[PDB]
Design a protein around this nucleic acid. Structure first.
Ligand SMILES: [Mg+2]
Ligand SMILES: [Mg+2]
Ligand SMILES: [Mg+2]
Ligand SMILES: [Mg+2]
Ligand SMILES: [Mg+2]
Ligand SMILES: [Mg+2]
Lengths: 367, 367
DNA sequence: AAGGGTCCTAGGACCCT
DNA sequence: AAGGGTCCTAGGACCCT
């Protein structure tokens, strides 16, 4: 039953990429811009007040010397994201992606192979790589302690390999399930790693200050929980299961309540190739007429290219819109003759358009 | 591109099963009863006026000597259904199920292997098994004619095997795609087979009298088409694509219009093991109070048994209801500890019940 | 008061930058 | 005026007996 999981989280991902291809930006405070949004920034800029997901106005206020690069085309970030996952797949092939910069790996089978190859002499010599959460004391006779420490050594090899092979830095967290691995990897956020021994599981979850910090609990779920007087991890631990079921559902209630105890039995899933390809564009209630084709035609040309590179073929298309005030969408299957180019697709999408501040296209259901 | 497909359709399936396990019912007119509904009947009863899906009142009127057996528990029909599919899977493993009594098989690879094993001498000796649709003339030099005729010989071997091994009779239709195979298999409905040569494709589709007879066109679609003045296959062939798209959708319009020409490029899919297990019960606004557990508990006990036999494990449950006047449903995932029994499930379902003339349970999303 | 099946759709929730 | 991802839900359509 006992598992050793690792969670790898790159530091200021987009910014770290821009700082790589243009070393001239290192040491200088950097923000990565998407329209009016500074979506992330390096640490030279966080010190100066800039914060993730900050207005381009407020950010230049706290740092007028802030150098900004446009990060709207994710192509380069996506390509590097998959270079990271692919390298980790060398260690163990079961690698789950979370967004572009986070990866889960189940190290269990790999920890146990390393253990058989050791002797009674070197086992007492097993050491930790990186921080132990809560400065908790190690017990070389606790077999769970030994396995987690081996997990931290693997985690350090990955992080070094990532830097040696892709010049990227990041954090790692080693724990017994995915929830705790992710929560502990950020205890030392700047290019460091942390291992969570079981006896500190409760210190970790109770170190949080709002239930939203639990991966699995978002805006709607949080707000519903505070409309019930649930503001802390412990409030949710002790809240009535029944009342929780008959207010949020039997699936939401019974899993988030297990997350509040640090429990999470979900396996690390192999993300493999993507299940979808999409592109978005946003605009200040600009598209006011059907000549919004050009904006659509742009999105296809990049998707069609990305698909051709992927080699697989999609069988469903989707169009999304956002309307000046909540999103609406229409999809349909892809004609067969088309699957084996640009002109016909457009006319499908506009038929979808006419059935109905943002336009987006997606290719899903891939073979 | 050229395919040889076969469609196998058993004669009065439920009735033929009841006549097997009780030979005493053969020769006598038989209906299979589900509540007030005579869902099917043998041919000794169709002659006497009884019709598929007929009131138990009107049927006994046209035939008071009608012997009826209850067919509400489908267990036996389902078990025989899969004995049929499994036997056909011996011929070629790619077998698509349609309901309990119909099966599609792609005979293409099997037709071509048989052809290489022949000599120029026996090829002119190739003969048809069963009817040729529209008494059309065979051309032993048309390679498509030869392949379809080989398809009819395989179809005859299946039907014989089905009778020799399971004592079941049925019809087969051999054509170049799934739509036409299904349409031609019923031209001689009582334990016979028919092959459709390409030059008669249009005689077959135009032999239909309402667009509803096209597999793919149902109640809602038919009615929408008649609200537009489309009553015949040809009306739909000639109807405006645009008007069809902007009234039914780009997926519905552009495929049903291809079905009206006898075109259908969908492949024969391997149905394999089921994707769901469900049980239903109906009742004259009977369940009026929460003690409807007993009716639910019945459905679980049979599903739980069927699942245990299957060996796979489900990960989602669903509850369906119908309310005296349109169905409503609630589902959720299956707790993990449960997956590896009866008491806990009930309390999930009732929570689903309280969130909300028929009750039903389903196990889906199987591993 | 049938008793089952299949697959799709539009929208929702969650996770990142 | 971010720009992407994942998976689930309730209901719909279609096909049989
Ligand atoms: Mg991250
Ligand atoms: Mg990060
Ligand atoms: Mg959260
Ligand atoms: Mg049939
Ligand atoms: Mg039949
Ligand atoms: Mg039809």
């Amino acid at each position: 039953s006992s598992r050793v999981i690792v969670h790898v989280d790159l530091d200021c991902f987009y910014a770290q990429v821009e700082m790589i291809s243009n070393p001239e930006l290192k040491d200088k405070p950097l923000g990565v811009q998407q329209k009016y949004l500074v979506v992330t920034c390096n640490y030279e800029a966080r010190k100066l007040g800039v914060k993730k997901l900050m207005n381009v106005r407020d950010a230049k206020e706290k740092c007028p010397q802030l150098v900004l690069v446009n990060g709207e085309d994710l192509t380069r970030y996506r390509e590097m994201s998959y270079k990271v996952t692919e390298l980790l797949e060398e260690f163990s092939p079961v690698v789950e992606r979370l967004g572009f910069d986070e990866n889960f790996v189940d190290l269990t089978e790999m920890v146990e192979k390393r253990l058989q190859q050791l002797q009674s002499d070197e086992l007492s010599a097993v050491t930790v790589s990186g921080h132990v959460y809560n400065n908790q004391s190690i017990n070389l006779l606790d077999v769970l302690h030994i396995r987690l420490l081996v997990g931290s050594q693997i985690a350090a090899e990955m992080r070094e390999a990532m830097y040696n092979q892709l010049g990227l830095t990041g954090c790692a967290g080693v724990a017994s399930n995915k929830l705790l691995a992710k929560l502990v990897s950020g205890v030392f956020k700047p290019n460091q790693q942390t291992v969570l021994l079981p006896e500190s599981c409760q210190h970790l979850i109770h170190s949080l200050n709002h239930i939203k910090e639990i991966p699995g609990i978002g805006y709607k779920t949080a707000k519903c929980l505070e409309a019930l007087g649930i503001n802390s991890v412990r409030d949710l631990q002790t809240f009535s299961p029944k009342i929780l079921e008959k207010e949020l559902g039997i699936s939401v209630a019974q899993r988030i309540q297990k997350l509040s105890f640090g429990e999470d039995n979900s396996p690390v899933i192999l993300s493999g190739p993507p299940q979808s390809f999409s592109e978005e564009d946003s605009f200040k209630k600009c598209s006011s007429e059907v000549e919004a084709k050009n904006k659509i035609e742009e999105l296809l040309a990049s998707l069609l290219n990305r698909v051709c590179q992927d080699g697989r073929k999609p069988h469903t298309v989707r169009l999304i819109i956002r309307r000046y005030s909540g999103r609406e969408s229409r999809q349909c299957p892809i004609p067969s003759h088309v699957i084996q180019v640009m002109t016909p697709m457009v006319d499908i999408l506009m038929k979808l358009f006419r059935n109905m501040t943002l336009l987006s296209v997606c290719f899903c259901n891939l073979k």
